[PDB]
Each structure stands twice: as structure tokens, then as C-alpha cells.
Write a protein that binds this ligand. Structure first.
Ligand SMILES: O=c1ccn([C@H]2C[C@H](O)[C@@H](COP(=O)(O)OP(=O)(O)OP(=O)(O)O)O2)c(=O)[nH]1
Ligand SMILES: O=c1ccn([C@H]2C[C@H](O)[C@@H](COP(=O)(O)OP(=O)(O)OP(=O)(O)O)O2)c(=O)[nH]1
Ligand SMILES: O=c1ccn([C@H]2C[C@H](O)[C@@H](COP(=O)(O)OP(=O)(O)OP(=O)(O)O)O2)c(=O)[nH]1
Ligand SMILES: [Mg+2]
Ligand SMILES: [Mg+2]
Ligand SMILES: [Mg+2]
Ligand SMILES: [Mg+2]
Lengths: 493, 481, 481, 493
């Protein structure tokens, strides 16, 4: 009932949601429509850090709130780039599409997030190749079709067939195979760098999880994403328009990847968190033959096969832990007993950690053979117990800056104050001699399933002996856990 | 050996091995699967926190407060045994919570089993007993200087209050009265439970905490008050104490009684009610229990957590269709529609006996408006919320004792007018929310007319949006104009 | 080119080059040498923050609020020029503050020059004029679309209110009324100045902020209210608005009116008074001014900051001995002694005309106690503190307009009883603090007897520690017992 | 008036102070007595970060509040060590002494903290050798004697002559010259590691300033000192009792020194902060002949000579900046004009940054010769302006982990879970290949005092040419600021 320039004013109030990390943020009605579906709401029942909650009691946060944050930040970054550079022709349609991809990027996560595709599926179905990101595309497709989203998209200026395709590309990368993307052209290349940056890992996903995980873990975040946004521009790089950082921010960019690595070190790869994920996975494996999840047209699926049917997969969340824990079926006894051990805190025992020494790298094809190697070590110590291959767990952890051996800053372009449209490169030695010399390494953790004092003492001797035999690094507590073993190795002394 | 645990609220804290032994049981670990704020998570996406981490915090703060009091006043004879007992009570105070915390004993049980009288605190005693017995805790207690018979009893008293119908406690004597004020303070509500949840809930909700518990601890002493030794606050902290209860009230207002959070709890409860006949939880000796009867068997109750929401949601049993359909409406965000809020005006108070009759009153209002729809009693929900400073009509500060700088052993009282004229003049009130289960535009417009008419008829306060939602109704009431 | 600056409160914020040009002047940079909370730093060691950083924050938030309103409502015709003008007013609002901020115009000037009538806001207009003229800002303003004559006038109006004795503003018309509510809101006190100082002062003080300004911005709109376009709050935010003023009051209570902070301000002011005849500040054309007369010359006033405390402290001039000795007492922490606090009881209000006569009243009280010491009027300090919600006796929420979800263009009013019965029943009160300049045990004991006797005689409230500090006095008053 | 076991109870209420960093903390009356003196209160008028406030508007904090924090944390750490290990025989006297040293460690700072002893004194009086820590001893002595503290110390169980000596040793290190300390013996060696740790830099001073500076700067702290305290013990190391860290905290210790370095990088060595300190120092130098500070017995001192008289030095704070700024004396015109340039933000112009390349290190004896080298470079660029030695400032910044070239973790001892009384060493390669390979480097900043566009463009050409001539690293913006210069160097391309 109000008019301006002779035309009626229309008031479209956005939904406002209060997030502890980002504060009060506005959700466009199209995002709301996507959020309020069983497919998206599912993420409320999947813990961001999986078993981490069993080590960090503040880490009760789920994928849901993280996904909201990623959608929000994606919008924030695209908007800012567009406000500073109208010449990029960023439309509200483009903004929505990037927001949606941010929201939906984690739709394919299973129970306990990275445990599911990182540990469980590879063991439960070695023939398949599965990733949560592929799952996110399938789940996104299912969300769209089951909830009649296409008309709603059209209503807000989206072109579904193109934009749905674009969204999927933002999530999983190129869907085929020159410029490998179809949803958007080279001059909007920078749009593909926002949610999931496959080129250098600088994206808003990190920005949310740094801040969110820190808030819940009780570890403090030292990366400033708002600063980064202020010092980001889009410049021409080899015929694409790409996000570039202000040159003097290079220190802060190295620090961003240092933060990521510290979080993996302190929290995500916590030695006990990992053994809890291991044990949960063992329980799932022992339960997989007996639990039934009903999918499309009444078909029955297993935990390991629910990934093949999005209707079933929709019902596959952290709930499965409790279904197992609370079960009475005798056939689930073995699974159930593992989870009960978790509850009584009768966990597999951490033996130690070591690393390879040279340019030596442990191949994934050889992971399975490692426990046997440990059991076959011959420590010159008098022991009450003999341990077998099956008593040992050997967990190999790849720690890196997100691109294996590569320095991600070598794949970043910068701009200078005096020529803010000119992209440049900055090399490592131009920056600082105090930076890492390598960008990838492996940590090897060894655990023992025999938890008594005598078995643990024995396991330590086998472990350190194995380290010596393989020319691995001297464990940090080596002289304490295995004083009779460490002298033999003079490379260690 | 003790353990160090990192909590986001309290930082790195130490857990005595006896506490670890109690924590690492199915009975305690259960609290990982029960959301602190229940349906609140469906309005505040940061509110994913569970009772578990809150219980750790309460146990920690209980220890902190007892230790500080003991360090400053050796004459109180606070032993490490005393410290452990208070820590255990802090840890175990919430053991009796059910699915979605206060939804369970606040909404579900009263509807599902009106004959019984159940509280989470009673549940905590039963669950604590079950925890002790099922996990062989008594020997461990003895190993660390506790005397189980006495101390178990003491712990239960700290949780639920006096265990019988003059000093009413057996676990500890009058000269350690102050130990009963730490976990759950029945006298004035100043306890460490609040201190943890203020800070924790604020951290997760994205609302800032304005109470400083560490300051309070520095300005706390134990003084003689009528043959008891009681916690007393420094006199000049009286302002900050009023602010503590103001903070509590603001958190209820903004978050815990959020109009949508409450309707989600309502809907979840409806789903539980429609599921209760069909879900089976196996308890002691294979006996079968229902959601509503699991409170009678701690073995079954151990397996009754927020999981039940998802068991219902993921079920295929045709008998669970109705329950399942309510939860699906939650997921699609097809929620009951908020109509409005009002309050009583005078000394008038709505009795709980009459809550059930209210939707009928609303449906029977006769708005002088032409409507396309007629609504019935069953289309309305009337949610009556009691908001207070923790002791009904009473000012809790009237039950606080203070000490002065010049005589720190002398307990005194401070009255309200000695403090500030800007403080509340009353300490309890009721909020009345009305919702409609018919969600279409026409029904909602009708519901608004019935509601405002009802407010007028009952001499309740004018709804804030009254002139907008019911312009034809508001003029009739000149007390409103 | 614009600049990015990192503020701990607001993070990385952008400064338009015109704001930079204004910031980088001696007149603005001056604010780096004036503590926000004055003597507060001597009680709260984190409160080292200056007016400078606060002014940056206010300028930033002013821009934020105007921008948000404009983005949601293009029909308001908010221009970048308008944004700049509001930002400048935010930046420059505190230009007129003197040494130790509110101590200067609150305590010093009224004592040093009782004939004049001076406020920091008037000072800000004069200093703003001086800043513009001395730094050739007008051409720069023009370069960025401002119209100096009009916009300078507008800026001054935003700072000090209407510049004359019906729409009383010239800088902008009724349809941009809302622009005058942003920096300094004379109508209801809801402005961005509060928003910055809540957050900033809390950060430095070590007291937590419980107001959410970002939420407020999301629930703010501009609606027609009597031919003006005014900022309106969403109706359901009324609770949060009351809490905003509660927060203000708690900060005054805990920090800004801290009994020791105030006595430090008092003592500093005494030192300034004893120094005023002897310190020389060179102003325009070499003319000499005093601390008390520097307000008459902006060139001199530019050089009048917290530095004056240290000029006095470090001086050797025998004529400054008395001033210097007061500051040394501050350093040795030989402060005047706090005796107690009381309040008036009825509708009774202490007039400012009578403040000067109060120490004499205290000295003339006749306590029925045998004392070793007789105290005189000059041994007592009586500090009367007006505590209110910003508009004397008035409820500021009565001067707020709201909008409802179903009609977001329609401004409405909400009354107090429509909200909550737990809110204040009055919005102003007075606190009376009494101190003694005689610091020995015997004098202090005597002062307490005089004070409590005086409270009894005047029918003031019973001091909180009354029975402890003056046990022989309190029984006489049975209104107290 | 209350009794227990027949004896009167005495209630000694400590003063409580609210600090934003540490919260409500208790001050022992002896600390209060020391705090409430002109010598200590002086620290309220000296900014922690000096010129930093002119770049970071939140950095208004003074040495005073930092000193309170250090005193508090010193007490916290000593108390915790003593609570866990009664066998160390830590007394309340020991606690007080460490608290006092923490409080008083910064008493010797001058105007703008590190500017004074880092920049001003070395220029104003090159013959002398002065450090703030030496100043802190002298000021501490003056504080004690002028305020009659010795009797108060005795009253609380201190033995002044021994303990005063001990306090001074904690502040400045050994006062002479085997075990080089006299205040306490080898079995309380760990007490010397608390306030100022000369062996490996792990002390409570860092812990306070990390947290405090971060709070004011608007940069977030990522070090957790409370965690460290929980994982700290005292163990026998080469006949001393020394503070040892839990072995698995080694990652977090490396991160502690990384945090320190990031703070220097982002904030303390900010290129503009440093030029402001430079300019302030220039102003002091031009004022030094004309400002008079009255010391003991009416004697007159200068800014540069006030360090010789503690009574004068007591009156030498950040106030001197404003005395200069507000002065009218024609003789102070030149000083005053520099400060006015600061206020108008007419600052010397940043030209660029480079580093040495090899194991090459720029000697301090050669710093003075550098501007001349820059001015003598011969860029093959056509310029409107010729610049001289005096137009250039060359600021050489030593960035390191606190012990020059050394890895501080090589001077840390650790303990293991299974043997918490046994000290061990952990080497760099036992930890991680992603850590720094070097622990020290130099940054070379160049500035120009001629601020016009033409002079600045010229300065850039001289600078980059100089970098090329010296085989220094290619400036990050080199191709942008000096495109005609960079091609000549093929080591750069
Ligand atoms: O005082 C409050 C009230 C709500 N919230 C949160 C809860 C939620 O995440 C967001 C939106 O809540 P609000 O109550 O504003 O939304 P609503 O219930 O959808 O209200 P309406 O639909 O009437 O606008 O703000 C707060 O942080 N503070
Ligand atoms: O890593 C940093 C660097 C600077 N600052 C702060 C200091 C200041 O308040 C704001 C701007 O600093 P910056 O160094 O980006 O500005 P500049 O020195 O003016 O750089 P240039 O003029 O080269 O853009 O950011 C940070 O918070 N973090
Ligand atoms: O509500 C308050 C009051 C004071 N303070 C701070 C100021 C100071 O840093 C510390 C101590 O202040 P308090 O008012 O308790 O001390 P006092 O004035 O010395 O009171 P008294 O001497 O009566 O104990 O607490 C707060 O943080 N909150
Ligand atoms: Mg809503
Ligand atoms: Mg462990
Ligand atoms: Mg700059
Ligand atoms: Mg005091």
C-alpha cells in the first residue's frame, strides 16, 4: 500500500538466522526452499568431525550448520568481488548459484563424515570408488527432483538445466574429460574458485570450518577471512578471470595453510580420535550384513550399499551408531560389543608414531602389509607375550598443504598496489626462509588391540624394532618406551 | 591417573580418576545423545550441544567453587572427599534427562502418563543408583577416601534435595550446609549449574553472556547464618546478583521459550505420543517398555535418547505413519502457525488445572468479523509460559546473605529498596502464546480474530500487533485505547 | 584511494578518502590523547582506550546503518553523499571532548568557570568548524559530491541537535528525518554511538557485552511516523530494546560510575583547579589561555589533552606544588576514603542547586556516638549520581516506533504493560556517594557515624553496610527495622 | 571475632583487579605496595607497541597492564609446578619473588618501548650500551629505596638482600662472570625460567603479550598457555631442576615460536609502524639538545641522558612526544615539524623489501653504509629526479625464533607419559618435515624521504637496481614497480 515513482512498493522480507560463527545472516527464499527438505535437514544428524567429539567434548557440531556457513560465505565473497568490480558482470543469479553450491557441497557426507568415505566404504566395498562429493551431486539431484525445486529456481531468474549443471561442477569439479566447464565460461572462471577451489584450495569452505571447528574445539583460530576478502580481486591470468590476492598478503596465505595443518595435527588427526573412528568403522563392518535400510520402491540396502540409492542414503546418518548400540539382535552382538568398548573407554592402545626418512614414501598398496611387518619384528627383549599381525593397527596419515607435494602458493596469483589489474607470481624464496621446505609428509601411527600391560609393553618393543628395521624416524618417546631397542640404531644416536 | 580434557567454555580441565570412572559408563555417555536445548537446535543452528558437555562443566565448576572456598577458609574443614562428592553430584545432576531434555519431563510425560509425577531430578537419582551398581563404583569410591553409604546418599541429596519429609539432610551436617548450595541451590538458585549453562548456551546460541562467575567466586565467603555455614556474597555485588537473574530471564525470553522452538517441542511431543504405543525398548531381563514407561526401568531408560526422533522418522511400520508424518512436517517446515501472545493483567494468574480448557475458550470467542472459516478447539494450541526469577513470586535476593568489607564474617541481609528503584517490582509473570494448526491464509486470519477477541473478553493485554492483525476487534476495548 | 583499517571491535573496515582526509588532521588526531573513560583506567587496567578509536567506530557504524537501510529501501533515496555526511558526523561527534572525557565538562568546567555553559557537543561543532577551515576540507568535500554549506550545517546538526529555537532541521528534510537518528539520537537514544561504546568499553573493561547491534540492524526499517520517515524496530525486538537500556545502566553501574573511578576523577579535577592559574596554553596569534579558558580558542584547545595530567605531575614550578601533590597522592594510592552510599526514598529528588550544601549537612549531623574526632564540611565529599535510561524520568521505549511482520510499512506503538511485568517501574533514580578526605581510622569511623545519621535524618535509604558501619545509629530508625 | 581450634581467625582480604585478558586476579599486599609507586605507575604512560598504535588503532595498551599480567602468570606457573611437585620445595616466598620479578621486568622501558632502546639511544649516544632490562634493575633498585619496600618485604617472609638480588637476576640474567646465579641454587634453576627464559625463550612474558597484544591488535591468538602449564613438569637435566614439556606438546611448542614470528611479521615489524618509530626517533634526536628533565638534586638531564638518573627517568615517558608536539620554542621547530608530519600523515614513503640470498648476512657495522649504496645504484631508466644517500632509509630487520640461528626446541627438554621424571630431547627430524629449515633471516626495507610521485618512482628504480647489484631477492612487486630493471637479472627470471 505504498508507492514510489507511481509504482507500488513490494516488501520481500528475507528469513534471518542467527549463527554463532557468522552472526545474523539473511537467507534468500530459494535457499530456504532448498534447506527445508529431508535431503538437507539430514545434515543435522551427521557430526562434522566424526569421532572427534569423543576426544573434544565441544565438537558436537553437525554438517548442517557448517553448510549454512559455507553458503553464506560464498555469497559474501561473490558479492564483494562484484561490488568492487562491476566489470565482471556478476549477477544475482550467479550469486544464488554459488550460494546453493556452498549449501549443498556436503550433501553426500555419510555417518561421521570423513570416517564414512575415508575408512568404511574402502573397507566394506573395495571394488567401488566413492567420494562424498560424488554423493553430494547425486543427493543434490535427488533433492531437486523430489522437492520440485526447478520451478522455484526459474521463479528467481535461474535457468535450471544450465545452473543445476553449474552447481554440480562447483561441487565435484569438471563432469567430463581446454576450458573443461560448461555451466559458466572462462570470464567467470573465478566463480569455480569460491566453494571448492581445486586449483589452490583457497575457498570459503575452509574459512567456515577454521572458524567453526575452532569455536567448538576450544582451539583459537588465527586466520582472518574478512581481511582476505578486502585484499582479493579478480585479474586476468592466462585467459581466465581468476581471484588474486594482494601481494603483501602472501605471508598470511602461507599462514592459512599452516592453520589448516595445525588443526589436522591437533584435532582432526588426533591419535585417539582416529582410533575411535577405526573402532566405529569396525563396528559398521561387523554390522553391515545385518542392518537393513529401505530405499526406493521398498528395496533393501545395507550400510555399504545405501550409497547406491539416495532415498536409502537419506536415512543413513550418525543414527546408525545408536541403532547398533541399542540393538538386541544376536547377529549384531559383535558390532554392538565394539561400540560398548567405546563407551567403557576400553580403546585400542596407542603404541607410538614414526615417519619415513628420505624421499621415501609409503605406498597405499602396502598399507595392508604393515601390521604383519610389525608382528614380524624381532626385538631383543625378554617378553611374556607374543603378538600377531592381527593385534596391530598401522594407521598411515598423509599430512600436506592440500595439493600433495606441491606448494599451493605456486598456484596463487597476486596483485600489487600500483597495478591492481595485473596478476603476478611470487616464489617461495621471495617471501621467507622460515617457511616449510616440504609440503607433504606421512605420519605412521601404531596401535595394539591387546590392552593389558604386558601386551602393551611388548607392542612397544615390536614397534620400535620395526622403526629401526625400516630406517624410520626414532619415536619421540623411543628411549623411554624401548630403552633396550634404541641403542642398536646409531643413526638415532 | 587423572585426565586433562579441553572444553571450549572452561578450557583445559582436570578430571580425577574417580570422575573418569563414572564418566566412562553407558549411563553417563548416554548424555552425548540428548540435546541440551531440545527443539532449540531447530531455531538456533549453533545449539547442537548435548547434556554430556554441560555435565562435565557443572562437575568442574562445582570443584572450582568448593576448592576456592576451602583455600580461603581452612576453618571450614573442606576435604578432598567433600570436593569429589560435590564434583560427582555436578557430573550426575542431569543423568535423568530424557529425549530433548525439558521437552520430555515438561511436555511428553505429563501428557503420556498423567497419573505419574516425574521429574528429571528424580530420574537422575535412579540413574545414578543404576550407574553405581552396574559399574562397581563403590570399591573405586572407597579407594579414594569416600565412604559410599554416606557419600552416595549425600550426592543424591545434592541432586534432588532432602530425601524425606530442623536440618533435613543426612549426608553432611549444618557446618557444611554450604556444600548443598553448590550444584543445585534450592534456597536461592545461585549455583554452578546456571554458571555453566549461561556460558555454554550463549557460546552455542550466538547470544553473549553478561554474567561473570569468576568474579562471583572471588567475592564469595562462608559465614554463619542461623547455625548453618552458608555461602555469602560481598554486599556491593548485590547489583551483579540481580543481573544474574536478569540474564537467566533474558535467555529464557530470547532462546529457551522461543515461540517457534516451543512449537517444535510441541510437535515432537505429539509425534512421540502417536508413536508411544508402537515403539519398544528392551529393559531389564528382556522386559519391553514404551517411550512413556522407560522411566520405570533404568536399563531401558539408558537406551532412550534423541535417537527416538530418528527411529520414528526413519521407520516404515504403517502403525508409525501418523508419528512419522508429524516429524516430516517438521522437516518440510510446515509448522503450526503462531497467532500471537498476550498476558494476564491484574494479580490474575492462570492455574495449570485450566490450561487444557483454553483452546476451547479461544474457539468460543465471538469476533464481530465476517469469516470464511469456522475454527474449533482442536485447531488452537494455547501455550502458557511461567517466567520468573526461579522461586515463583519470590525475590531470590531476599534469600541471599551478604558480607561487608569491614566485617567479612558477619552475614547480613539487603532489601530491594536498599539497592535500586530500577529493578523489577515483581518476579513472576505468565506469557500466553496461541498457535493454529490450520496453516492456510483464511484460517490464520480467522484465528487472529478469535485470539484478539479472546484477549479482549478475558481482559488480557493487547497483543503488540493487535491493531494490525485484528483492526476490527481492538477498538471495542477502550482499556486498550 | 580508500584505506582499510583493522579495529579489534569491528575488524577490517574501509575508510573513504574523504574520511581519511578528515582523520589525518591535528584536530582529529588529538583524540588519541584523550581516554574514553577518563579516570576509569585507574580502576580498570584494560581501559586504556582513547576517543580516537571510538570515533572511528562510530563513523563506521553510522555508515553501516545508513547503507543497510538504503539497500533494503531504495525508495528512501539515500545517496552516497548522505552516507558520507553521516559517517563524518559519526567521526567528528567527539571532537569537543577535553582531558579525561566526561570529567572535563562534567566536573572541571562547571567548577572552574561556573558562569559559562559548556558541553563537549558544542565543543565538537567548534572543533569541527576549526578542522574544516584549517585543513581546506571544503574543496575535498566538493570533489566527492558534497555541498559544503548545506552538508557542514547538516553534520553540525547531527552532532549537537537543532541549531535554533515544526521541522527544526535545515541540513535535510522530513523525508530524511531518519538520518538525524543515526549518530546521536535525541529522541530515544538509540544510536550507533552506544553500539560502539558498549562493545568497545566491554572489550577493554573485561565486562561482557550482551547487546547485539547487528541483529538490531536486520530488524530495522524506515516507516512514516507523522510526516517524517523514521527508523522503526520490529515489534518482537521490544524486549531486546529494553535490554539495550539495561545494558547501558549496568555499564554505568559497574564501570562508569565506579565509586573509586569517580573519586579519582574528583581528585584529578581538584588538581586541575589548583593548576589552572599557572598553566599556559598558547592559542591563536600567540594568545595565552588557561585549562579553563582553552575552550574559547580551538587552536589552544587542540593542545589540551590528557597530557596536562603529566605536565602537572612532572612540573617543578613551586606554584604547581599543590596541584602536583594531589596527583602524587593518586600515584601512591592515598585516595579519599569511601564512606557509603544511599538513595532518596519517595518521589523525593535532590536538586543540583543543593549539591554544594550537602557536605555541610553531613558535617552537621549529630550522631549519638562518642567520637575522638570532629569533622567539618570540607572533610566530606558528597557525589550525587543521576542514573537513568537516557531521558530523565521518561521511558525511551515510549518514543520508539515499531513495525509488524504482516504490515512492515505501518508504524505502531507498544506500551510498557504490553511487554512484561518484570521491567522497571521507573526510569530514573539518584545515587548518593559520600567520601571523607581524612583517611585515618578515627576520622573514617567518625565519618561513618555522621553519614548514617545524615541518612536517617533525611529519610534516605539504609546503607547496605549500615548495621556494621554504624550499629549505634541504625536502631533509631524503625523504617529501617 | 571467630575462633577455630581455640585460636582467633584472621581474615586477610587480597585486592582483586579485573584484567580483560586474565580476568579477576588477586594481588598480594606486597605486590600492591610495589605497584602503587611513581616508579611502577610510570608504565601507564608508555605504550606497549610504541608507534604500532599509529597503524593499529586498538593498540592503545600500556606497559603497566602487561606488567600486571606477567606478574600474575609468573605466580600461576610457579604455583602450578609446586602443587604438582611438592618435592621441589617451592615456598610462598619463592612465589612472591617470581611475581615481583614479573611485575618489575619492564620497569626500564622508555618512551614507546622498544623504539627507545632499539632506535633512539643507539643513535643519540653511540658510546653507551643500554638495554631496557638494565634499566629495569636500576629502576627496581630506585623503587625499593625510595619507597621503603625492604621492611615490607621482610614482613612477608622475604630476605631482602638475597631476594632483591634474585629478582634482579630474573630480570637481567646473571649479574657477573659453573652455576652463575646467587639468588637461588641449581635445584631451583627452574625459577629463573619463568619470567625471562634466557635458555629457550619459553616464559610467561610471551604468554601475556601474545594474548594481550592480540586482544588489542584485532589479530587472534593461537597459542594456549593454560594447556602448556598442564603439560609442564620439572625434571633433572644435567644437574639442574628444569621445566620440561610433555613430549607430544613439541608440535605446539614449534607453533608458539611460529605465533611469535607471525606477530612480528603482521604487527610489530609493520612497515609503516617502523617508519613511524623512525620518524618519532628523528624528532627526539632533533629535540634532545633542548628538552630538560630535572633529576636528583635538581640536576638537568636530556632525553638521551635521563637513563643515567632514575629520578629523571621516572619522568621520561610517552609524554615527551606531546611536549615536543605542543612546544612553542623556536629551537624545537625542527622536532615539532617532524611530529606534525606524522599527524598530517605525510610519512616517509615505503619503497620495498628484499632479503639476502645465500648464507649471506648483513653485518650491523654496515647498516649505516646502505642508503649510500642505494643512491649509488645506476638504474637504466630515464628519470626526472636524482636522489641522494640522505633521501633513503634502509631498515634492516632481524627475524628469528629468539635465539639467532638456533632452534629453541633443541634447548627444550621433554618428558614422556610412562616416565614423567625422566628428561629427554627431541630433534627436529623426529617431529615433522613441514617445519622451518632455518630459524633466522633478515628483511631489508627501503624507504624514501622525498614523497612526491616522481621521487617515489625514481626511488623504486634505484632500489630494485640495488637489489640486482647485491644479488638480493627479487622484490615481490619488482616487475610492477621496476619493469625495466627486473629483466636484467636472469637469476630472477
Ligand atoms: O532474541 C533473539 C531471538 C531470536 N534469535 C535467533 C533465532 C534464529 O536463529 C534467528 C531468527 O529468530 P526470530 O525470532 O527473529 O525469527 P522467527 O521466529 O522466524 O520470527 P518471525 O518469523 O516472527 O520473524 O534469531 C536470537 O538470536 N535472538
Ligand atoms: O597482516 C596484517 C597487516 C596489517 N594489519 C592491519 C594494520 C592496519 O590497521 C590495517 C591495514 O594494514 P596494511 O598493512 O594492509 O595497510 P598499509 O600498510 O597501508 O599497506 P598499503 O598502503 O601497502 O596497502 O591492517 C593486519 O591486521 N594484519
Ligand atoms: O562490577 C564490577 C565492579 C568492579 N569491577 C572491576 C574494577 C576493578 O578492576 C576490580 C575491583 O573492583 P571493586 O569494585 O571490586 O574494588 P574496590 O572499589 O577496591 O572495592 P572495595 O575496596 O570496596 O572492595 O573489579 C568489575 O569488573 N565489575
Ligand atoms: Mg519465521
Ligand atoms: Mg590419554
Ligand atoms: Mg597504506
Ligand atoms: Mg578497594
Amino acid at each position: 500500500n505504498l508507492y514510489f515513482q507511481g509504482s507500488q512498493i513490494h516488501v520481500d522480507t528475507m528469513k534471518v538466522i542467527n549463527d554463532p560463527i557468522h552472526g545474523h545472516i539473511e537467507l534468500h527464499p530459494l535457499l530456504v526452499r532448498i534447506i527445508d527438505t529431508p535431503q538437507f535437514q539430514r545434515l543435522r544428524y551427521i557430526k562434522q568431525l566424526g569421532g572427534g567429539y569423543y576426544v573434544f567434548p565441544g565438537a558436537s557440531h553437525n554438517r548442517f550448520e557448517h553448510s549454512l556457513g559455507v553458503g553464506y560465505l560464498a555469497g559474501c565473497l561473490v558479492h564483494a568481488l562484484g561490488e568492487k568490480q562491476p566489470e565482471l558482470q556478476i549477477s544475482e543469479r550467479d550469486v544464488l548459484c554459488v550460494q546453493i553450491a556452498g549449501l549443498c557441497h556436503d550433501l553426500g557426507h555419510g555417518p561421521f563424515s570423513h570416517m564414512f568415505d575415508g575408512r568404511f566404504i574402502p573397507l566394506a566395498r573395495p571394488e567401488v570408488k566413492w567420494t562424498h562429493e560424488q554423493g553430494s551431486v547425486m543427493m543434490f539431484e535427488h533433492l531437486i527432483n523430489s522437492n520440485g525445486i526447478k520451478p522455484v529456481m526459474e521463479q528467481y531468474g535461474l535457468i535450471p538445466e544450465e545452473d543445476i549443471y553449474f552447481i554440480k561442477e562447483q561441487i565435484v569439479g569438471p563432469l567430463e574429460s581446454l576450458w573443461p566447464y560448461k555451466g559458466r565460461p572462462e570470464n567467470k572462471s573465478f566463480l569455480y574458485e569460491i566453494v571448492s577451489n581445486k586449483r589452490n584450495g583457497i575457498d570459503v569452505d575452509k574459512w567456515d570450518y577454521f572458524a567453526r571447528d575452532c569455536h567448538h574445539l576450544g582451539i583459537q583460530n588465527n586466520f582472518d577471512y574478512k581481511r582476505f576478502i578486502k585484499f582479493a580481486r579478480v585479474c586476468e591470468v592466462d585467459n581466465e578471470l581468476r581471484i588474486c590476492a594482494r601481494d603483501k598478503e602472501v605471508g598470511n596465505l602461507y599462514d592459512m595453510f599452516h592453520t589448516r595443518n595445525s588443526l589436522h595435527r591437533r584435532a582432526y588427526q588426533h591419535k585417539v580420535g582416529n582410533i575411535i573412528d577405526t573402532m566405529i568403522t569396525d563396528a559398521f563392518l561387523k554390522a553391515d550384513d545385518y542392518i537393513e535400510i529401505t530405499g526406493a520402491g521398498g528395496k533393501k540396502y545395507r550400510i555399504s550399499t545405501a550409497i547406491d540409492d539416495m532415498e536409502a542414503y537419506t536415512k543413513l546418518t550418525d543414527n546408525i551408531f545408536l541403532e547398533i548400540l541399542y540393538s538386541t539382535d544376536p547377529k549384531l552382538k559383535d558390532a554392538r560389543e565394539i561400540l560398548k568398548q567405546i563407551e567403557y573407554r576400553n580403546l585400542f592402545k596407542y603404541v607410538g608414531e614414526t615417519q619415513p626418512t628420505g624421499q621415501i614414501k609409503i605406498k597405499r598398496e602396502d598399507y595392508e602389509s604393515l601390521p604383519k611387518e610389525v608382528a614380524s619384528a624381532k626385538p631383543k627383549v625378554l617378553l611374556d607375550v607374543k603378538l600377531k599381525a592381527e593385534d596391530f593397527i598401522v594407521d598411515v596419515i598423509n599430512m600436506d598443504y592440500g595439493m600433495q607435494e606441491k606448494n599451493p602458493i605456486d598456484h596463487v596469483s597476486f596483485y600489487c598496489k600500483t597495478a591492481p589489474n595485473r596478476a603476478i607470481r611470487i616464489t617461495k624464496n621471495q617471501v621467507s626462509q622460515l617457511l616449510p621446505e616440504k609440503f607433504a609428509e606421512q605420519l605412521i601411527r601404531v596401535y595394539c588391540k591387546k590392552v593389558d600391560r604386558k601386551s602393551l609393553y611388548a607392542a612397544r618393543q615390536y614397534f620400535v624394532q620395526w622403526c629401526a628395521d625400516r630406517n624410520f624416524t626414532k619415536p619421540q618417546d623411543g628411549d623411554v618406551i624401548a630403552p633396550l631397542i634404541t641403542p642398536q640404531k646409531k643413526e638415532w644416536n
